[PDB]
């Protein structure tokens, strides 16, 4: 995490050069799309949908099997979340911290972290309003 | 890591130079008015005045002498200054209530030599050059 703090970590996934299915995967593309929509109806977010297909279902890189990305499939079917996924998680974190701080008013370390999180929300909401993914008057609390 | 470099960063560079020019002691003196008011001359190279009395100023250590001077009241603004009288003798040529022409001492208001606090010099008395009298090329009038 480099936007705030002193972290300089480099840990992530590395996508392969060869973008073809491994040829032992017999699932058709239309079955994978129906397979994505069913997981959404259960209540899972797109980042969790990809992991469930990767772990116990043989599908790495849904985009390589079906030419589309997971969020694009959900948007077509009307199952996209109202607020973008990363904004939803940041707002949830700020709410839990604010609930903690009314009981513990001397936790000055947590007050410092809340200022960092709220700045991140305003920066992120600024971008989504510009690319028209949010209403122009969204106005985080 | 000392200056900005952008292609559209002219405004920052202009403002930076303007504020840092004031730190130059010489530049500031020529662009303000406090020095001009302080200067007994109103920014001129010479001035005329009336001799009030003759005084002697002790030379600063490690020198030892009595430097002959006079105190003058300027005609243009009634300010009082102290002017050095150069050359051997040359004090007898100057009498009280005489008109003199005073000039600078060569360091633009700074004191010169072992004479403490003296920045002016006499060059003319009674409309006759002081050095001319010293060489006996002219006679003291009246």
């Amino acid at each position: 995490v480099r936007m705030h703090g002193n972290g300089r970590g480099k840990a992530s996934s590395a996508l392969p050069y060869r973008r073809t299915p491994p040829a032992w995967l017999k699932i058709a593309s239309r079955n994978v799309v129906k397979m994505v929509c069913k997981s959404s109806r259960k209540g899972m977010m797109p980042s969790q949908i990809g992991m469930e297909l990767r772990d116990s279902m043989g599908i790495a890189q849904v985009k390589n099997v079906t030419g589309r990305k997971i969020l694009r499939i959900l948007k077509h079917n009307g199952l996209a979340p109202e607020i973008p996924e990363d904004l939803y998680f940041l707002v949830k974190r700020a709410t839990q911290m604010r609930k903690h701080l009314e009981r513990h008013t001397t936790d000055r370390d947590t007050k410092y972290r809340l200022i960092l999180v709220e700045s991140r929300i305003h920066r992120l909401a600024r971008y989504y309003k510009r690319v028209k993914q949010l209403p122009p008057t969204w106005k985080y609390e | 890591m000392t200056k900005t470099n952008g292609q559209n960063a002219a405004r920052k560079l202009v403002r930076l130079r303007c504020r840092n020019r004031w730190a130059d002691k010489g530049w500031k003196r020529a662009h303000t008015f406090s020095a001009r008011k302080a200067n007994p001359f109103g920014g001129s190279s010479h001035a005329k005045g009336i001799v009030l009395e003759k005084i002697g100023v002790g030379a600063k250590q490690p020198n030892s002498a009595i430097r002959k001077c006079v105190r003058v009241q300027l005609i243009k603004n009634d300010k009082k200054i102290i002017a050095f009288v150069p050359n051997d003798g040359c004090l007898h040529f100057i009498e009280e209530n005489d008109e003199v022409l005073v000039s600078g001492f060569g360091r633009s208001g700074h004191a010169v030599g072992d004479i403490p606090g003296v920045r002016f010099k006499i060059v003319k008395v009674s409309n006759v050059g002081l050095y001319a009298l010293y060489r006996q090329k002219k006679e003291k009038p009246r």
Binding site: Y17 | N5, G6, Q7
Partner: protein, 129 residues
């Protein structure tokens, strides 16, 4: 963060040449970097180089022959008319008998001698000698 890809690459080549290395790896690459290297190659200042594809900004491996003294970029990219070539030559080149200033013009990327012959101006990119 990294602001200029061309400046990063030219600094890497110059350091490896100063240390007496034979090969140098450059990352990341771009179209401007490749064109600059070809101007150097045409005048005999570097050997062959290879571009590797990785589905991102690729990498370049360059062979050095010991003839390069210094290469560097000019930032920002000042405009240069056809009457300003003499001024740039006297300011950043060791002499008037060797060394080149590289420009980008409407006719493409070229050295100052070729640009003057075709009567075109442009923006300064870098230099080498």
């Amino acid at each position: 963060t990294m602001m200029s890809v061309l400046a990063n690459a030219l600094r890497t080549i110059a350091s490896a040449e100063r240390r007496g290395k034979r090969q140098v790896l450059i990352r990341p690459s771009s179209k401007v970097v490749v064109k600059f290297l070809q101007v150097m190659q045409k005048h005999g200042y570097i050997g062959e180089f290879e571009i590797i594809d990785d589905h991102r900004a690729g990498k370049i491996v360059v062979n050095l022959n010991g003839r390069l003294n210094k290469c560097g970029a000019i930032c920002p990219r000042f405009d240069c008319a056809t009457t300003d070539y003499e001024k740039w030559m006297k300011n950043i080149l060791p002499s008037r008998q060797f060394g080149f200033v590289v420009l980008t013009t409407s006719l493409g990327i070229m050295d100052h001698e070729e640009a003057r012959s075709r009567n075109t101006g442009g923006k300064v990119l870098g230099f080498f000698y």
